[PDB]
Amino acid sequence: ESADLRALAKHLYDSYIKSFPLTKAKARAILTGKKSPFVIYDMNSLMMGEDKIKFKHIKEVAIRIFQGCQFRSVEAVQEITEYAKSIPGFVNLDLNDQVTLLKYGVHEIIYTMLASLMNKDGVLISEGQGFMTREFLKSLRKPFGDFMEPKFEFAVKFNALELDDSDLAIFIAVIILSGDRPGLLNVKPIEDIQDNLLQALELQLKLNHPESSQLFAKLLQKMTDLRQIVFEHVQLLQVIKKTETHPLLQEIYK
Amino acid sequence: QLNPESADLRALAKHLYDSYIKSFPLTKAKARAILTGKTTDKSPFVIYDMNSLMMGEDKIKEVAIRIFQGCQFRSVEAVQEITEYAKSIPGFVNLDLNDQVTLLKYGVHEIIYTMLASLMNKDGVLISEGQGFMTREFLKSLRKPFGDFMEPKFEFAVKFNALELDDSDLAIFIAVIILSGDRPGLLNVKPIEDIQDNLLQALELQLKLNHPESSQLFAKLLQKMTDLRQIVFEHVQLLQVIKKTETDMSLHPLLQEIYKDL
Numbered sequence: 001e002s003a004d005l006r007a008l009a010k011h012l013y014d015s016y017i018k019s020f021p022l023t024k025a026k027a028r029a030i031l032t033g034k035k036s037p038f039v040i041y042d043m044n045s046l047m048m049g050e051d052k053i054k055f056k057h058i059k060e061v062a063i064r065i066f067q068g069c070q071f072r073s074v075e076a077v078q079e080i081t082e083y084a085k086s087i088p089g090f091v092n093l094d095l096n097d098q099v100t101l102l103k104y105g106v107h108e109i110i111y112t113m114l115a116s117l118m119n120k121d122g123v124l125i126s127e128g129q130g131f132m133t134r135e136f137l138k139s140l141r142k143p144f145g146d147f148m149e150p151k152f153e154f155a156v157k158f159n160a161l162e163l164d165d166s167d168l169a170i171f172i173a174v175i176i177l178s179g180d181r182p183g184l185l186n187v188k189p190i191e192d193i194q195d196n197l198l199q200a201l202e203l204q205l206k207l208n209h210p211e212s213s214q215l216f217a218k219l220l221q222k223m224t225d226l227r228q229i230v231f232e233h234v235q236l237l238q239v240i241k242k243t244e245t246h247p248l249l250q251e252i253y254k
Numbered sequence: 255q256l257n258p259e260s261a262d263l264r265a266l267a268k269h270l271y272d273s274y275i276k277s278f279p280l281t282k283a284k285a286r287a288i289l290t291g292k293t294t295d296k297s298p299f300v301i302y303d304m305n306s307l308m309m310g311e312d313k314i315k316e317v318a319i320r321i322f323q324g325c326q327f328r329s330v331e332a333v334q335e336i337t338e339y340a341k342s343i344p345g346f347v348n349l350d351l352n353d354q355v356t357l358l359k360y361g362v363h364e365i366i367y368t369m370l371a372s373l374m375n376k377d378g379v380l381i382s383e384g385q386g387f388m389t390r391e392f393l394k395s396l397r398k399p400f401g402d403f404m405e406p407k408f409e410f411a412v413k414f415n416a417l418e419l420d421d422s423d424l425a426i427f428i429a430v431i432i433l434s435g436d437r438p439g440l441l442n443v444k445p446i447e448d449i450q451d452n453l454l455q456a457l458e459l460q461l462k463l464n465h466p467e468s469s470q471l472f473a474k475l476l477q478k479m480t481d482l483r484q485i486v487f488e489h490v491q492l493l494q495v496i497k498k499t500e501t502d503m504s505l506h507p508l509l510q511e512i513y514k515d516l
């Protein structure tokens with residue numbers, strides 16, 4: 001059984017590597033020092049990064065940034081979908097259930113992985129070629145300035161766990177196979193798979209972090225912070241439905 | 255398997271179970287004995303309508319307002335019980351006082367809904383220390399916004415009760431809930447976290463011994479936290495509606511104090 005647990009952990013790791021270009025190890029290497037990324041700390045550096053970078057979706061700053069985040073989210077959704085398909089048992093599930101699990105899981109996964117790109121002072125952007133400051137994002141006009149902040153608070157807590165990519169792969173898989181998403185038709189094989197994934201995660205944390213007491217529990221506890229962050233994000237998405245500022249574009253985004 | 259550290263963990267579990275029994279008059283064992291017709295305990299009077307509500311007000315020790323007040327009183331008593339219990343958790347009273355206060359303030363609701371599940375089935379809830387049973391439909395028939403108070407608690411309780419926890423499991427789980435290091439405004443997170451870590455080891459051991467053929471119960475239980483916090487938030491929003499719709503109704507200052515800054 002342990003054999004299958006480690007084989008699973010490895011499979012998931014390889015698949016995570018193939019699906020997500022910018023890994024946590026890479027991101028960390030960039031954030032600490034190892035070809036320094038362009039830094040966006042204010043208006044002028046933003047404009048410079050627009051001209052010198054590849055972020056023009058051919059007019060107010062906060063709205064442009066928000067839309068960028070949108071575009072990148074749609075890409076992430078495709079990457080996560082591809083990863084989900086590699087989870088043993090996943091494609092064998094009822095197709096409606098696959099859709100439901102992805103639809104409810106992508107936000108939680110996006111914030112999880114976003115933590116890998118973040119420190120307390122900012123977030124790697126543009127494939128890791130840039131770094132936008134926390135203070136700059138906070139300085140954005142309301143309510144756009146309040147979007148990223150809760151996520152920095154989450155990431156600071158989450159990053160304290162010092163998980164690596166091989167831990168994260170399994171964790172993300174556990175997140176996808178959540179039996180309590182609304183509207184599931186057949187919960188049983190979902191919870192069966194998830195229980196296998198949770199055993200794999202347990203073994204992984206125990207081997208990879210022998211000195212981290214109850215890391216498994218703390219990680220599981222982080223799911224509360226994730227769901228909360230997702231709820232809050234939704235809550236201020238509703239507020240943006242004020243702000244009177246591409247119908248095909250309006251179609252591409254959920 | 256038997257060894258020194260795990261012996262310590264079992265000792266902690268026994269301690270907590272013992273304090274739990276001492277602190278909470280109405281256990282899940284007694285609740286279940288009452289709900290399932292066990293001869294250890296007497297049968298409850300059932301309130302399912304206004305008529306039986308009026309018969310019950312006699313046979314038992316505006317309508318929605320009166321029910322809500324009884325619920326208030328009971329909640330106060332529960333805060334007292336949980337506080338008493340919290341003091342027995344090793345290390346809790348040694349923490350910074352303000353942090354003890356914060357921990358209680360945020361833990362009390364999550365615990366109340368957790369234990370409330372013990373008194374529930376899909377059809378209703380035990381009341382008046384188990385002498386009564388108020389049906390789910392009757393509570394749902396109450397005038398808005400009072401008719402929507404209890405439904406979420408029921409849904410949560412059917413889910414949570416699916417875990418089949420007994421009192422000895424709950425004692426540790428409740429201890430784990432109290433000692434959450436992510437409560438807002440904590441001065442000293444670390445010692446809280448060390449205690450919770452010990453409590454989590456204890457919970458893990460307890461579930462694996464008490465539910466051997468129950469795969470990943472520890473994980474499922476920990477995941478119930480999401481359900482708890484959602485319930486608490488919905489309830490708080492509903493109370494916000496209440497305060498504005500019924501300015502003639504008095505909320506208890508202890509409860510108001512728990513609600514301030516949430």
Ligand SMILES: Cc1c(C)n(Cc2ccc(-c3ccccc3C(=O)O)cc2)c2ccc(C(=O)N[C@H](C)c3ccc([N+](=O)[O-])cc3)cc12
Pocket residue numbers: 055064065066068069070072073076106107110114123124125126127132233237253254
């Ligand atoms: C995947 C992802 C990355 C890499 N960043 C950092 C980022 C990404 C792009 C830029 C950027 C800005 C300007 C110019 C270029 C770039 C650039 O990096 O390319 C900066 C930081 C994110 C920030 C927020 C979210 C988020 O909250 N998503 C949820 C699901 C959501 C989001 C939105 C909605 N919604 O509105 O409906 C729902 C759910 C997601 C991401």
Ligand SMILES: Cc1c(C)n(Cc2ccc(-c3ccccc3C(=O)O)cc2)c2ccc(C(=O)N[C@H](C)c3ccc([N+](=O)[O-])cc3)cc12
Pocket residue numbers: 320321322323324325326328329332366370379380381382383388489493505509
């Ligand atoms: C501790 C507790 C118990 C045992 N029950 C079941 C119950 C308790 C008492 C009765 C009862 C009803 C009528 C007559 C006698 C009894 C009886 O059992 O004694 C029935 C079931 C509860 C139900 C709801 C809440 C709750 O959400 N409280 C918050 C703080 C709140 C609660 C209320 C309000 N509010 O509306 O003012 C705000 C916030 C708390 C409890």
